[PDB]
Design a protein around this nucleic acid. Structure first.
Ligand SMILES: Nc1nc2c(ncn2[C@@H]2O[C@H](COP(=O)(O)OP(=O)(O)NP(=O)(O)O)[C@@H](O)[C@H]2O)c(=O)[nH]1
Ligand SMILES: [Mg+2]
Ligand SMILES: [Zn+2]
Lengths: 147, 421, 97, 295, 135, 49
RNA sequence: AGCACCGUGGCGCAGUGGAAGCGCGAUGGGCUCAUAACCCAUAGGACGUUGGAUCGAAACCAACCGGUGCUACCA
């Protein structure tokens, strides 16, 4: 179909952030990967078409007319893309603060690294092309004899 | 035997028994110590002889073990025979919160100590500072400051640290004591360290005044001995001598002696007469004990108690020599302004000491004693308290006392005192 | 005095909390390691009233005076014993998550 | 050594055939109605099951389905299975051609404890009298009938084990051979009955001395106390030393384990009294925990 | 900041969780199989085994996540990771009774102790069946 | 598909021996990816975009 | 350092002299629209090691080794 991954535009609202716990009446509690503590909401195209769990990472928006009102979840990042994001160069895995930075909660927590793609297979596509219009030897039984 | 007693102070997690492990090559245990993990709990002792390495000042590399360095009779570092200079004992005084009182117990024995700080923590913790003021009661002159970890973090943070510490010291205690790098679970830069210990002078002591000994250890009975003569392989008054020559087959009096209960409200304690069976220090056996060094004076008579040390602050002398036993001591006390050992944010933000008042739990650390006291009188003359001690104390000097109070399930130095008596 | 002090500030008194799961997303929780002197009826009956729960005052052989609760609570079964001299902050096992 | 040799040899065999697996323990062919018995489980067969007794030969018996327990079980298999040895009692009994009918569901609130004990005693009696009998000649039937069977008849239901008209008498004390008849097999009987059994295992507390208190003479006093502690004695074992655990400085733990009876209790009490009253005047006083146990 | 294989999961039967990468993980911090397995299974207070093709099985049910990591963190900061430097190259020893562990990248020795839980587990949670089996 | 097979049960009622009959037993999930089965082209373009 | 207890299938254990079993497992089938639940068939044992007692045992005795608990704290 289409892309499963988008990047924040720093202008026009939109900043990465992580869910903490969940609260009633469609709202939840939400915390900033630089700033202090927040409360979020959700949009009505995700009211039960999409479920945003706790400690899932998402992309907010912010109000244009007035800051420091409330913010809203306008997207979700699938776990597949979270590991990728966090790797590259981008967001902290500790979500600066955590609850708070002055209590330094949840210490390392040493890196995990998705270094598990290659298993030591999948080496060499640099080899032969077809040989056709040649008589060549190639009888089986090979190895079968060492005498 | 050892001639000079060298202690160890420093907050826990900065090394204590670690530096000792480097040099001596031995460790201390009691079983309980393992179960709580990296708490030392009671006191260290070990012995390492000094013999000068004769082309050594600071050569680049050698084996990590200290046997190429002193505590050997041959040298491979200079490749030449060795020659005696000195011999030392070690003592390890705790750095954990609770263990203040037992640091105090072992604080009047020593003739010097090493402060230990590490680069992995903040500038001056609370417990470090409290150690220092504790010292100044008993008024040691020689002191040495060290950085235990310098190779576990960079050679940048090291420098800073050193500058700060350097500033702070010689603005508290003069002599401008040196601040020195070492390693001692990698066991390097001993040569450096050792050179500074060599220069620390002979202290003076009296060898012809009536006997005085300070006990801090007891129990050596068995397990085995099991068969034959049957049990055990009688006990000890394992401690230091300050005065006189403790020879074998002398007659000794224990001057706190056996404690007897109150008969209504007044208690009595009767001395214990005992004989020296043998003097044992290190793995060697002595025929006479010279002041300085930990000598295991072999005791005699009856069983019961003195399991690990129930000889806490006990004084041994010769027959017909009696340090005066006092049940009541008139203490002239001076308090500090800061309740050291408090941990809140930073050491410098500390709370201030509350005045000494009637009817409060004290302690009273008279030398090696840990006697419980209650204030009954603040009046006799201003700033004098007539304090009644349940556990009797023997005066041989005017006595230099550190006073400890409970702050929150643990005592924290509050002041110092001197007995008028 | 000091003896008792140590023997208490550095020995025994170790405070167990644990969480498990009954099914799907239902959960359960316990506490153990609290001294016999304290009334269990008064602590349990507090936890309950401060949030839809369900206590007990179970006594089990060689583990006794052990109390459990209904729901996942780990955080608040630690928090409430911190400020209140019930756990020297050193004896706090969590087996949750 | 023909003993060693016989063993190693007979791992390669070809086995020596022996009576371990058959022959009725008592006279009777079959029990009376409502008698507990000790059976073995040959199989299940869905509709009830076929088991065998062991107290009387290998003779069958068959429990009927819906007669194993009160509870729903669904599967019969996973309560009882096969190869077990279990209790059961009787309901009906045909002596005409030997059908017997049993229940496991009427054996309730133990009772099957008695069954264990009973069975075991039986097994002892039997395995004994064969090793006797077949060193010389004669089949087991006859030797049995002349040694085993009398003591089940003479005194009613006292077995050939317990009360002191039976066999374990003749392990303590002798003189009961007389009213029975017995050639050479008397020898082999009594001597196998010794060679195997065993009594077994008994208490072994360890005196505890707490020599609390003081006095211008403790150690010396403690030594004197210690010297009378153990040997002492010796005599044939049980003994009473070694002695051998240091606990604390006042507390000394002396062993004292017996292999034979309550007789160790007397020795410990006497030793403690001598040490405490006559001695312990030169040192502290002797106190007991007590003292015995460990257990 | 070391690199640890990111445990990876499967939801089979909507009860069990199979962990494929088990074998690889245990190798990495240089500790054996059975001992590591014990700690995990004790904390969660579930059954399941290993065996197989060295993929673990557990009766613990969770919504599929990367949140298995918390468990591993506990194990690694108790057992393997020295409190001198912060670094795993570490190697277990047998010293005295209930004494173990050594560091070797600066050789500051450290002891630790091993779980043998058995204090309180509650009860969960069907009955009838329990008594039936314990018949 | 299994979830579609779990929504075909049949039926309620506590007990039929000692154990329970319940349908549904809760699920509020929910789906991940939606893999999207990539091969229009992959590698070369990625160094420009 | 002694005392006490324990050592049996991958793991936890049963088995007081006629002497290889059970529960959890692994692997492969069957029941079910699927999954739990539940049946069945397979392979998997120096009964810690050594000596001794015994017609004969894995079971009893001794020696050593390992594991765990308790008391010991070692000039
Ligand atoms: N890398 C490194 N490790 C060190 C250094 N000094 C000590 N350690 C480590 O720190 C640990 C603590 O040793 P220890 O001396 O018991 O600390 P302590 O401060 O004496 N304990 P206590 O506070 O109770 O006296 C030891 O395992 C040792 O390996 C150092 O300079 N570098
Ligand atoms: Mg230490
Ligand atoms: Zn390290």
């Amino acid at each position: 179909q289409k892309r499963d991954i988008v990047y924040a535009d720093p202008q026009e609202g939109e900043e990465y952030a992580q869910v903490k716990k969940a609260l009633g009446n469609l709202r939840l509690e939400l915390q900033l990967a630089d700033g202090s503590k927040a409360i979020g909401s959700i949009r009505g195209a995700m009211v039960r078409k999409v479920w945003i769990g706790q400690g899932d990472v998402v992309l907010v928006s912010k109000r244009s007319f007035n800051k420091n009102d409330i913010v809203d979840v306008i997207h979700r990042y699938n776990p597949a893309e979270v590991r990728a994001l966090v790797k590259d160069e981008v967001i902290p895995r500790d979500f600066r603060s955590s609850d708070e930075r002055d209590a330094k909660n949840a210490h390392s927590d040493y890196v995990f690294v998705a270094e598990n793609d290659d298993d030591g297979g999948a080496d060499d596509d640099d080899q032969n092309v077809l040989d056709r219009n040649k008589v060549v030897l190639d009888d089986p039984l090979a190895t079968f004899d060492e005498l | 035997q050892a001639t000079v007693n060298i202690g160890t102070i420093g907050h826990v997690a900065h090394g204590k028994s670690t530096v000792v492990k480097a040099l001596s090559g031995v460790k201390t245990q009691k079983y309980h110590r393992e179960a709580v993990m990296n708490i030392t709990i009671h006191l260290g002792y070990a012995n390492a002889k000094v013999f000068k390495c004769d082309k050594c000042e600071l050569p680049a590399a050698f084996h990590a073990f200290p046997s190429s360095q002193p505590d050997k009779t041959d040298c491979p570092t200079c490749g030449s025979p060795l020659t005696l200079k000195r011999h030392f004992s070690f003592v390890d005084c705790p750095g954990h919160d609770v263990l203040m009182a037992t640091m105090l117990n072992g604080a009047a024995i020593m003739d010097a100590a090493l402060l230990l700080i590490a680069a992995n923590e903040p500038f001056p913790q609370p417990q470090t500072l409290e150690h220092l003021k504790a010292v100044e009661i008993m008024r040691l002159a020689n002191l040495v400051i060290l950085q235990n970890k310098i190779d576990l973090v960079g050679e940048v943070h090291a420098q800073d640290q050193y500058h700060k510490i350097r500033n702070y010291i010689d603005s508290t205690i003069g002599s401008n004591i040196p601040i020195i790098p070492i390693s001692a679970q990698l066991k390097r830069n001993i040569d450096y360290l050792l050179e500074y210990l060599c220069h620390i002078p002979l202290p003076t002591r009296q060898l012809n005044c009536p006997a005085h000994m300070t006990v801090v250890r007891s129990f050596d009975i068995n397990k085995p001995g099991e068969v034959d003569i049957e049990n055990l392989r009688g006990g000890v008054a394992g401690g230091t001598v300050t005065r006189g020559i403790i020879r074998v087959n002398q007659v000794l009096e224990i001057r706190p002696g056996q404690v007897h209960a109150q008969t209504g409200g007044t208690f009595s304690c009767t001395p214990l007469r005992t004989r020296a069976l043998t003097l044992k220090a290190e793995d060697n056996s002595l025929q006479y004990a010279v002041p300085g060094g930990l000598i295991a004076v072999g005791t005699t008579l009856d069983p019961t108690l003195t399991r690990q040390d129930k000889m806490v602050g006990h004084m041994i002398a010769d027959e017909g020599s009696l340090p005066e036993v006092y049940a009541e001591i008139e203490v002239q006390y001076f308090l500090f302004e800061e309740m050291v050992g408090r941990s809140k944010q930073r050491d410098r933000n500390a709370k201030r000491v509350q005045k000494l008042n009637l009817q409060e739990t004290l302690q009273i650390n008279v030398g090696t004693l840990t006697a419980g006291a209650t204030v009954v009188n603040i009046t006799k003359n201003p700033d004098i308290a007539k304090l009644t001690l349940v556990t009797p104390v023997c005066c041989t000097l005017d006595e230099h006392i550190a006073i400890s109070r409970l702050v929150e399930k643990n005592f924290r130095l509050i002041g110092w005192g001197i007995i008028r008596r | 005095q000091q003896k008792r002090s140590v023997q208490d500030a550095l020995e025994a008194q170790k405070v167990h909390i644990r969480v498990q799961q009954r099914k799907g997303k239902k959960f359960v929780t316990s506490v153990q390691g609290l001294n016999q002197a304290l009334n269990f009826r008064r602590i349990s009956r507090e936890f309950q009233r401060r949030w839809g729960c369900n206590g007990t005052v179970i006594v089990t052989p060689d583990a006794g005076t052990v109390i459990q609760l209904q729901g996942n609570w780990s955080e608040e079964i630690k928090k409430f014993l911190l400020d209140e001299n019930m756990a020297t902050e050193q004896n706090l096992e969590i087996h949750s998550l | 050594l023909d003993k060693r040799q016989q063993r190693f040899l007979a791992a390669c065999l070809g086995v020596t055939t022996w009576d371990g697996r058959d022959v009725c323990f008592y006279e009777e062919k079959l029990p009376k109605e409502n008698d507990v018995v000790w059976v073995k489980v040959i199989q299940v067969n869905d509709t009830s099951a076929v088991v065998q007794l062991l107290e009387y030969g290998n003779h069958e018996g068959i429990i009927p389905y819906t007669e194993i327990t009160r509870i729903r079980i669904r599967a019969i298999g996973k309560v009882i299975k096969v190869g077990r040895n279990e209790a059961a009692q009787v309901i009906r009994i045909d002596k005409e051609k030997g059908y017997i009918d049993l229940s496991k569901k009427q054996v309730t609130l133990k009772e099957a404890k008695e069954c264990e004990a009973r069975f075991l005693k039986g097994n002892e009696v039997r395995s004994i009298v064969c090793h006797v009998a077949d060193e010389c000649g004669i089949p087991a039937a006859q030797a049995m009938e002349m040694i085993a069977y009398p003591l089940y008849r003479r005194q009613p239901g006292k077995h050939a084990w317990d009360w002191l008209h039976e066999l374990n008498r003749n392990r303590d004390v002798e003189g009961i051979l007389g009213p029975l008849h017995l050639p050479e097999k008397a020898q082999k009987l009594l001597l196998a009955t010794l060679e195997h059994t065993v009594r077994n295992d008994t208490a072994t507390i360890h005196a505890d001395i707490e020599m609390t208190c003081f006095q211008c003479d403790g150690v010396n006093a403690l030594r004197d106390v210690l010297l009378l502690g153990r040997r002492f004695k010796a005599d044939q074992e049980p003994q009473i030393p070694i002695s051998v655990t240091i606990v604390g400085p006042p507390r000394y733990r002396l062993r004292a384990k017996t292999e034979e009876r309550e007789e160790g209790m007397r020795r410990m009490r006497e030793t403690i009294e001598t040490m405490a009253i006559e001695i312990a005047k030169r040192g502290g006083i002797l106190r007991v925990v007590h003292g015995p146990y460990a257990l | 900041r070391n690199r640890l294989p990111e445990p990876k999961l499967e939801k089979i039967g909507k009860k069990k969780v199979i962990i494929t990468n088990f074998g690889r993980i245990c190798q990495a911090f240089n500790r054996p199989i059975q001992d590591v397995k014990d700690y995990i299974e004790k904390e969660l207070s579930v059954g399941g085994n290993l065996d197989s093709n060295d993929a673990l099985i557990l009766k613990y049910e969770i919504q599929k996540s990367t949140a298995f990591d918390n468990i591993l963190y506990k194990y690694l900061d108790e057992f393997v990771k020295c409190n001198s430097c912060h670094k795993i190259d570490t190697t277990l020893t047998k010293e005295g009774r209930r004494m173990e562990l050594r560091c070797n990248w600066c050789t500051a020795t450290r002891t630790v102790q091993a779980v043998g839980s058995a204090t309180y587990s509650a009860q969960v949670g069907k009955r009838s069946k329990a008594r039936l089996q314990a018949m | 598909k299994q979830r579609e097979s779990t929504l075909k049960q049949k039926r309620l009622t506590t007990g039929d021996d000692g154990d329970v009959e319940v349908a549904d037993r809760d699920m509020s999930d929910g789906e991940g990816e939606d893999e999207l089965f990539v091969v229009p082209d992959v590698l070369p373009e990625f160094t420009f975009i």
